[PDB]
Amino acid sequence: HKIKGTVVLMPKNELNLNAFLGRSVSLQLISATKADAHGKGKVGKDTFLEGINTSLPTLGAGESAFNIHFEWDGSMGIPGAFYIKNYMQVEFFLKSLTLEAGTIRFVCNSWVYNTKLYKSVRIFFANHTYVPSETPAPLVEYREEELKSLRGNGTGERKEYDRIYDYDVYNDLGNPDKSEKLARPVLGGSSTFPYPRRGRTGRGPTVTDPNTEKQGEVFYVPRDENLGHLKSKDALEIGTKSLSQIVQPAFESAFDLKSTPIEFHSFQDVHDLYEGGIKLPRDVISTIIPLPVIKELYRTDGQHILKFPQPHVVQVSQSAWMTDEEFAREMIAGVNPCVIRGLEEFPPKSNLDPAIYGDQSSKITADSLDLDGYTMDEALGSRRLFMLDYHDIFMPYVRQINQLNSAKTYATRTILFLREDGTLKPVAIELSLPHSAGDLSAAVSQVVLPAKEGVESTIWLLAKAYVIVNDSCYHQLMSHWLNTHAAMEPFVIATHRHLSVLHPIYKLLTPHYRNNMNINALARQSLINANGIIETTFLPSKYSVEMSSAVYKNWVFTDQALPADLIKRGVAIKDPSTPHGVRLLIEDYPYAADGLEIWAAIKTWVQEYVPLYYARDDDVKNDSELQHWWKEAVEKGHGDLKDKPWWPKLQTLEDLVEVCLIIIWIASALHAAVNFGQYPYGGLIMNRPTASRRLLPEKGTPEYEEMINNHEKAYLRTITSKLPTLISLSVIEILSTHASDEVYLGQRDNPHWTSDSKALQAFQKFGNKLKEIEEKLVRRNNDPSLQGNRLGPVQLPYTLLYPSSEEGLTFRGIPNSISI
Ligand SMILES: [Fe+2]
Numbered sequence: 001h002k003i004k005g006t007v008v009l010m011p012k013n014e015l016n017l018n019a020f021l022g023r024s025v026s027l028q029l030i031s032a033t034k035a036d037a038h039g040k041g042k043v044g045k046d047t048f049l050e051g052i053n054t055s056l057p058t059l060g061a062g063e064s065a066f067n068i069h070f071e072w073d074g075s076m077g078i079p080g081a082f083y084i085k086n087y088m089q090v091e092f093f094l095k096s097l098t099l100e101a102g103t104i105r106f107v108c109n110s111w112v113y114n115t116k117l118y119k120s121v122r123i124f125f126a127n128h129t130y131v132p133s134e135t136p137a138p139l140v141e142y143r144e145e146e147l148k149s150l151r152g153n154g155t156g157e158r159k160e161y162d163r164i165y166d167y168d169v170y171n172d173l174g175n176p177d178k179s180e181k182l183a184r185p186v187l188g189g190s191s192t193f194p195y196p197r198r199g200r201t202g203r204g205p206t207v208t209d210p211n212t213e214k215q216g217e218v219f220y221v222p223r224d225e226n227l228g229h230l231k232s233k234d235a236l237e238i239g240t241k242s243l244s245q246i247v248q249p250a251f252e253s254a255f256d257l258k259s260t261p262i263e264f265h266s267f268q269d270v271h272d273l274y275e276g277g278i279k280l281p282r283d284v285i286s287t288i289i290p291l292p293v294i295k296e297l298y299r300t301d302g303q304h305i306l307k308f309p310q311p312h313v314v315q316v317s318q319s320a321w322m323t324d325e326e327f328a329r330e331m332i333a334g335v336n337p338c339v340i341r342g343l344e345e346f347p348p349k350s351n352l353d354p355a356i357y358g359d360q361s362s363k364i365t366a367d368s369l370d371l372d373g374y375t376m377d378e379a380l381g382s383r384r385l386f387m388l389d390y391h392d393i394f395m396p397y398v399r400q401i402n403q404l405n406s407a408k409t410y411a412t413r414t415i416l417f418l419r420e421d422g423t424l425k426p427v428a429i430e431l432s433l434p435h436s437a438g439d440l441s442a443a444v445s446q447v448v449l450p451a452k453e454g455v456e457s458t459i460w461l462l463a464k465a466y467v468i469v470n471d472s473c474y475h476q477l478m479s480h481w482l483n484t485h486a487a488m489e490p491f492v493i494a495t496h497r498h499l500s501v502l503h504p505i506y507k508l509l510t511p512h513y514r515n516n517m518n519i520n521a522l523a524r525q526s527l528i529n530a531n532g533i534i535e536t537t538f539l540p541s542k543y544s545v546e547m548s549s550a551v552y553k554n555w556v557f558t559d560q561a562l563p564a565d566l567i568k569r570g571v572a573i574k575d576p577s578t579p580h581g582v583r584l585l586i587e588d589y590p591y592a593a594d595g596l597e598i599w600a601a602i603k604t605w606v607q608e609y610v611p612l613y614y615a616r617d618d619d620v621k622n623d624s625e626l627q628h629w630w631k632e633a634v635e636k637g638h639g640d641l642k643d644k645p646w647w648p649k650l651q652t653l654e655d656l657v658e659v660c661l662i663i664i665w666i667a668s669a670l671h672a673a674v675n676f677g678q679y680p681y682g683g684l685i686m687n688r689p690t691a692s693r694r695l696l697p698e699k700g701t702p703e704y705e706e707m708i709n710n711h712e713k714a715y716l717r718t719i720t721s722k723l724p725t726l727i728s729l730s731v732i733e734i735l736s737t738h739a740s741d742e743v744y745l746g747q748r749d750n751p752h753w754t755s756d757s758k759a760l761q762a763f764q765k766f767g768n769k770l771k772e773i774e775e776k777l778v779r780r781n782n783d784p785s786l787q788g789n790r791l792g793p794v795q796l797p798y799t800l801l802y803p804s805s806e807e808g809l810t811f812r813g814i815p816n817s818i819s820i
Contacts, residue, residue: 001071002072003101006056006065007097009095014093015093017052027068027084030044030083031077032079042076044071052064077138080139082097082123106126123146126755128754129502130500131503155202160220165222167200167493167636172219175215176212177215189640193546196552201219203215222517233293236739239297239734240527240533242293243730260279264722274307277306277307277308311681311687313683324450326792326794327464329423332590337591337673339479340388342385343387347362348362352395357436363445369417372420379417383418387414388414401539409469410432410445412432412467418586423788431445431447432445473547473690476690483560484667488666491513491637492516494629495509495629499625499629507753509663511743512663538728539692552641557648571585571586580599586789594800595673598665599665601766601769602661605763605766609762609763620651620653621651669801669814673801676811685729689720690720690725691719693718734820738806738815742815742819744804774802
C-alpha cells in the first residue's frame with residue numbers, strides 16, 4: 001500500500017521543527033519504469049511531512065529527520081525521482097530522501113526556496129548512474145528539461161535563489177562610475193585581451209561605459225555553489241571582503257594619524273609581528289577583534305596588540321631564508337615550484353623585438369660563473385644547467401610599471417647549477433631594463449653574482465629580492481589565479497549546463513569543483529577588482545590582471561598534465577623504461593617526485609572508472625551530453641583559444657581519460673601545491689616580497705651609502721612597505737588555512753553518491769592507494785640522504801603533497817577542489 005520514507009533537512013539558522021509539519025512541505029514521487037501517454041514517468045500525489053523522527057542515532061550536526069509515507073502501488077513501478085515544494089516563507093537545505101522496502105536513496109544537498117519563487121518545480125533523481133543511452137525511457141525528457149532549466153536563456157539579472165549557469169567576460173572589475181582612474185580593460189572576447197570566461201551575473205551596464213558591468217553588493221553564484229558552513233570560522237571566503245572594506249581602512253587610519261611608525265626600520269621590526277606583536281590604537285583593535293574569520297588571524301590582549309602566527313619558514317632558523325641554498329631550493333620545493341626550466345645553450349636567448357626594447361643579448365658571461373669546476377660545455381651536456389626566466393615575460397610591462405609612483409622592477413633571469421650533491425645553487429642574476437631612443441631614465445641593466453661580504457653581498461641580496469618580486473607576482477597571478485581558479489571555472493559551468501546529475505562523468509568531476517565559483521566571485525569583488533587587494537599590495541598595481549591575459553595567450557590545456565609540463569620545461573625526459581614514463585633531471589625535485597605519485601594514483605582511478613560506463617571508443621563518440629559538454633567548454637568557456645590545434649577531440653576512451661585526469665589534477669594537487677605554502681613561506685615578507693619600490697642605487701648617492709651602513713634598511717626601503725605588508729600577510733594567512741569541513745582527495749561528502757558497487761570499490765582502492773603514498777612520502781622526508789632538497793637549512797619537511805590534513809594552517813593536505 002505505502003512506501004516508508006525519511007527526509008533529512010537543515011533549517012536555515014544552521015548553515016522550531018513542528019513548523020515543517022501540517023501543509024508546509026510536499027513531496028511527489030516520479031516513476032522510472034511506468035510512463036504516461038507522452039512517455040513521461042508517472043507522478044504521485046502531493047504528500048506532506050508527517051512528524052519528527054527521533055529514532056535514528058546517526059544524524060550530523062544541525063540536521064533533522066522527518067517521517068513521510070507515500071501511497072504507491074506496484075503498478076506505478078519503481079520510483080526514480082521526486083518533486084518537492086516548500087510552502088514556508090524561509091528556505092531550507094534539503095539533504096536526502098531514503099525509501100525503504102532494496103532501499104532507494106536520493107542525495108540532494110540543495111536549498112529549496114518558497115515555491116512561488118520558482119518557474120518550475122524542484123526535481124531530484126535517485127542515486128543511479130546513466131550515460132544518456134542508458135537513461136530509463138520515462139526519465140529521458142525530465143533529464144533534458146532539467147539541463148535546459150540550468151542553462152537559462154542568456155538574459156536577466158541573476159537572483160540569490162537562481163540555479164542558472166552561463167558565461168560572461170571579465171568586464172566587472174573596473175569601477176568607472178566612481179572614477180575614470182578605476183576604469184579597466186575588458187578581459188576576454190578580443191585578440192588583444194584573450195581570457196577564460198567566468199559565471200554570468202547580469203547586473204547590466206555602468207552609466208559611463210556600456211561595456212563594463214555595474215557594481216553590486218552581492219556577486220551572484222548559482223545557489224548551491226554558495227556553501228553554507230556550520231561554524232562561521234569555516235567561512236574563509238568572506239574574509240577578503242572584510243579585509244578590503246573594514247580592516248584595511250582601520251589600518252590606514254593608524255598610519256594617517258601617526259600612531260605607528262610608517263616604515264619598518266630593521267628586520268627585527270618584521271619579526272616582532274609574530275613575537276610580541278604590533279601595538280595599534282584602541283579603536284583600531286576594536287574594529288578588527290569581533291569580525292568572523294578575521295578574528296582568527298591574530299592573537300590579541302583585547303586592547304592594543306595584534307600578534308600574527310609564527311611562519312613555518314622561521315620555526316627552526318629565522319635567518320636561513322637568506323641563504324643561497326634556500327633561495328634555489330624554494331624553486332623546486334617552495335610556494336611556486338613549477339617555473340624553473342632546463343638550459344641547454346649559453347648565453348640564454350630572448351624572443352623579444354630589439355627594435356622596441358633595444359639589444360636583447362644576455363650580458364652574463366660563462367667565464368664569470370662558479371660551476372664547482374665544470375666547464376660550461378660540461379654543465380650543458382650533463383644537463384646540470386637550469387634557469388628561472390622572467391626576462392621575456394616581464395620586459396613588455398617594465399616601462400609602464402616603472403612610471404608608477406612607488407613601483408620599480410627589473411625583468412629578471414636567474415642561472416642555477418645542479419651540484420654533484422644533488423642540490424641547486426644560484427650562480428648569476430641578470431636585472432634587465434628596456435631601452436629606447438628618447439628615454440628619460442639613466443638606469444641601466446646589470447648582472448649580479450653571488451657574494452657573502454661587503455656592499456657586494458648587499459647588492460646580491462637585493463638582486464634576489466628583485467627576482468622574488470617577479471616570482472611572487474607570477475605565482476599569484478599566473479601559477480595560482482590563472483592556472484587554477486580562472487582556468488577551471490569554464491569547466492564547472494559547462495559540466496552543470498550539459499552533463500546531467502545522473503551522468504557518470506558529472507559524478508566523477510563535480511567533487512573537484514566544490515566552492516570554486518564562490519571563491520572566484522568573491523575574488524572578482526574584492527581580490528582582483530580595481531583598488532582591490534592584489535592591486536593595492538602587488539608590484540603591477542592597475543596592470544596586474546591584464547598581465548595574466550597576456551600570459552593566457554600561451555596557455556595550453558594538454559601542457560597542464562604533469563609529465564608534459566616537466567618535459568616542456570626541460571626538467572625531465574621521456575623514458576618508457578621508467579614507471580612514470582619520464583626520467584627526472586633533478587632526481588630529488590620534491591614537487592615533481594611527489595606529484596608523479598599523486599598523478600599516477602588519479603590516472604589509475606580514472607582508468608578504472610571510465611570502462612565501467614564506456615566499453616569502446618564509439619560509446620564516447622555517441623554520448624551526446626559528453627559531446628555538447630566538450631564542444632561548449634572549448635568553443636565558449638575557453639573560446640578565445642578555440643582556433644588552437646592542440647585541444648583533444650574527445651572521440652576515444654583515451655581522450656576521455658586524458659581530459660578527466662587533467663581536470664582533476666588541476667583542481668586538487670596542482671592547486672594544493674601552489675596554495676597551501678603561501679603563509680608558511682610568505683609570512684615573512686623578506687622571504688617573499690610582493691613589490692619593489694626603487695631600482696639599484698648609483699654610486700655616490702645617499703642610497704648607495706645606506707647599502708654599506710644599514711643594509712637591512714636598504715632592503716626594507718626596496719621591498720613592500722609596512723602598511724601593504726600588514727594587509728597582504730592577513731590575506732595569505734586566510735588562503736593558507738584548511739576549513740574543518742574540507743573534503744580531501746580520496747574522500748566524498750556522501751557514501752551513497754552512486755548505487756554502482758563497482759564504482760564504489762574502485763573509489764575505495766583509490767583512497768587506500770593515497771594512504772600508501774602518504775607513508776612513502778613520510779619515509780622520503782625522514783631519509784637523511786634527501787635532507788638538502790626536502791628540508792633545506794629552514795628544516796621544513798616538504799609535506800604540501802601529503803594527501804591528508806587536520807584543520808588549520810598545516811602546510812599539508814590535498815583538497816578535492818579549488819576551495820580557497
Ligand atoms: Fe587558491
